[PDB]
Amino acid sequence: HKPLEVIKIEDGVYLHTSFKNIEGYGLVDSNGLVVLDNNQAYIIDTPWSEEDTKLLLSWATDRGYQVMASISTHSHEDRTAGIKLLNSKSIPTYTSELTKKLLAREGKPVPTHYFKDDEFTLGNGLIELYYPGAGHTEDNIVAWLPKSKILFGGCLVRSHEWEALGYVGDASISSWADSIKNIVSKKYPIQMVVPGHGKVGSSDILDHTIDLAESASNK
């Protein structure tokens, strides 16, 4: 397919996007981040394939960055396809404990590190992880980047180009709006929200997601 794209979206923050080209629909995209702490790089969600993960690692190496770890924000392949490769390179991989268990239940490679806590931090205080409750999946977490004022909402949040919730096979639709409201309750001074699929937007992605969740739940 179309290979990995990596673009800068803030000082020390890059959006990585990988793709699948589906007959019947067309190109589907999948986003994660690279977050820098000086020269130390943290991967928030792997690309959607092992090959695209290799491209992301090469992207870092070519530019002199040192990849420290990855965190995956739920167990789906579009968040985790690269865990196997990172493990083979002795790069620490993280998920929540529930995500780890879900991966093992799917017969997929597990992270080398995991936490059973609603909050966890990577780097300085560079990346603040939070579990707001079930939505897109039972295990979805989000990441707040206090320096850049970016919330990585992952697949729990929906870009404005979408008029529905996306893939809901593993979703808890009746809990989804409440889980977004829990994010809102954190009172992050959000300047940008990055979704797992679709275009980056502003804080109103949260409101849009609540609208979509409440509509689908009442249906």
Question: Binding site for Zn(2+), residues?
Answer: 23, 74, 76, 78, 136, 155, 197
CB of 107 to Zn ion, least distance (A): 17
Question: Which 94-153 positions form the footprint of a second copy (CB under 8 A)?
Answer: none
The whole-angstrom separation of Cα 61 and Cα 44 is 17
Q: Which is nearer to a second copy, 127 or 213 (CB)?
A: 213
Pick between residue 126 and residue 198 the one whose CB is nearest to Zn ion.
198
Hey, what are 180's tokens?
């977004």
CB 42 within 8 Å of CB 126? yes
161 scored as a contact of a second copy (CB under 8 A): yes
Which of residues 127, 150, 155, 193 is near Zn ion by CB under 5 A?
155
Cβ atoms within 10 Å, residue 98: 18
Q: How far is the CB of 18 from Zn ion (least distance, A)?
A: 11
Task: Check the CA dihedral 37-193-199-100 and report its sign.
Answer: positive
Identify which of residues 71 and 165 has a Cβ nearer to a second copy in the complex.
Answer: 165
Tokens 């080209």 map to which residue?
21
Residue listed under structure tokens 């190109």: 27
From the list 82, 195, 196, 201, which residue makes contact with Zn ion (rule: CB under 5 A)? 196
Tell which one of 45, 78, 128, 139 touches Zn ion (CB under 5 A): 78
Q: What is the radius of gyration, based on Cα positions, of the chain?
A: 16
Asked if 17 and 31 count as a contact pair (C-beta separation under 8 A), the reply is: yes
Residues 6 or more apart whose Cβ sits within 8 Å of residue 207: none
| Residues annotated in a binding site for Ca(2+) | 70
**Which positions touch Zn ion (CB under 5 A)?**
76, 78, 155, 196
**Which positions touch a second copy (CB under 8 A)?**
20-26, 28, 30, 48, 76-78, 161, 163-169, 197
